[PDB]
Amino acid sequence: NDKVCELSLVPDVVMTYTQGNVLNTLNNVNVIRQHYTQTEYEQNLEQI
Amino acid sequence: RSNNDVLATSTMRVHAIKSELFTQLEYILTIGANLRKSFGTAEKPKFPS
Structure with a gap:
């Protein structure tokens, strides 16, 4: 009506839970694409 | 392996x-010459097969 509008929402799980130094703690995950530390860069370098 | x-x-x-x-x-x-027998000299040459 002329002042009460209704909002639909969906959770931004990516902002909510992932914050800080969390995802780095994760082990034994198959990764696909990431960005590399300088060390790891030099390792997967011949590859890239 | 294959x-x-x-x-x-x-x-x-x-x-x-x-x-x-x-x-x-x-x-x-x-x-093509047998190196280990007589050659001779310039004026008298021998050619050992």
């Missing part, structure tokens, strides 16, 4: 080298 069931791979490099080097040599002197 099937095509293997992961995408692209980064081959000359990892190591080993080599059997020919360090010293030998020689064949192959001629």
